[PDB]
Amino acid sequence: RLQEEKRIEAQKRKERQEAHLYMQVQIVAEDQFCGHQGNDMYDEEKVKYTVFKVLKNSSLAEFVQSLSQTMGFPQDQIRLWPMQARSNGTKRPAMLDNEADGNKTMIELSDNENPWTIFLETVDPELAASGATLPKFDKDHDVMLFLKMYDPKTRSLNYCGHIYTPISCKIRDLLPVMCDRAGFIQDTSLILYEEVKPNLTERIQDYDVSLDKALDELMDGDIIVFQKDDPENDNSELPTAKEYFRDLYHRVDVIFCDKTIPNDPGFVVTLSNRMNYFQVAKTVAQRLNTDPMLLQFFKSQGYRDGPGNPLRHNYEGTLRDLLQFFKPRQPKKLYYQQLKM
Template identity: 30%
Template sequence: MAQDHRTIKVARDEDLRSQIGSGGFYFDLVDFDRVRAFQVPVDTTVILFMEELAKELGTPVKFQRLWLCQRRQNGTRRPSRPLNSKEKKLSIGRVFSADVKLFLEVLNPCSPRNLNREYLLVFLKFYDPEQTQLRYIGTLFVSCSSRPLDILPKLRSLAGFCADEEIELYEEIKFEPNVMCEALDIHHTFTVNQIENGDIICFQKRPKSCNQHLYPSVKLFLEHVHKLTVAFLLFYFQDSNCGFLLAAGLHFQLTLNLVFQPAPTFLRLQAFVLLLLFESCCAFYVFFFSIQSCWIVLYW
């Protein structure tokens, strides 16, 4: 199967929209373990595979543009370039030397048809500090020589803001080992801001006061969420001859936002569960509760 077929995972706009901000998924674009996967014979041409996608996903071939998603040096995986017309005529085995991950862009009347280096595909996330909510908005093509200032009217329209609403823009760069989310200079070009295909731009209302919200900026929110992801040592096993250390990461992120009306502030309850199994198979549970900025630790 591995030699005769390629596993091709295809992420769509619907996948990003359903995953980002849901179930504790905030960083990067998509979890490819939760998207459609296809086992494709290596001698199938790319265009025939696109016809199969049209049958399975309902998007006609003429409206499909497939982007190759590559892992960057910082550990993120982003769409880097679209497949060209020559590649579409070749077999899957010649175009892809191994299993591959793709992003399916669905073309609309406003989509540029003949892409060149002037156009950049960026992904948009909107952060609402009042609801402490981050969600995916969609994609946007920008010109390298244009400025973030030029797309502010479009972003206001997408978020439902009034025409004079002040907004801030950030680039979500990476999240491991630490969060890197930097403000964009809206007066400099996208080239100067080092924006490229597949980059993520987060935007939000400009907070009127730093003390108005618990996490007034998307950068602070992402840093907060990152701290909630816990990797813990699970197993330690040792037999009579030699010792083995078995480690696994346990990720629990349970965020419960309780809003009490008419109380003027949010009461936030964040629970984490850490499970440690010892040789005796006994279990030790630790729950961390956070009420706003105060931590209460309960052991039993």
């Protein structure tokens, strides 16, 4: 047994000393994109990969082969979409060029990136039994998009998978498919956007144009977000994806403590930096089952901790402004006290 512990520590130093020869490769499957609510495809924190310790100078064909065996899929029934970190702070699936990129090593394909994250497109093994296969993809003339539905009622995003389609296609021709995937009746009146990056969510105006023209900088892994064109949306809190990604971009968590209760640990509230007095007051009053009119809030002292000046209710400002004196680390807190009836 003591020998076996000398073989265990020893072999693990080789792997430590050989790790510079190896790279990790993180595979992510479309199931992982389901029910994600944030920008792009998935949350890097909540995502679950299928990892692979792989030789830096090994060939692609080798990985492809290996993969097909580990996961359990034919080699012609899977396609790889390497994840790309773009200039604009998004991470999307990008293409990879089998033909021109056929006789290159792994590490170089990652562009010296490690770990290297890769989207695995496989045919649903359920639909695969029923005669289906992974379609052909004219790199030059087809594009791969991703579809997201937004429900203003629930204020949520519902992944609707990806589609291959030809670049030349009109947007009007992809409406059915969107309706279907979202489970709407055909000829349902929709509203479409491009998720471009966080905070930026441009509306698509002319449907009767080619995809080329319709998304500024068309590329694979572009994301169309769509919803119902319905009056009921006005009722909601966030009728557009555009608004959603704002609330999300400006989402920030704030702790609230009773000034009158010494050392009160208080309660967090998730709020938006572009709120005004009213929106912050009304939020917290819902969390205290109280009239907002009975809440007095207090500004930040900047340097010292503890409640500062008493915040008047005609405060023309935004929460960004209230929080502006908290270092990145510093937890974001605001003091309040209740008033009398």
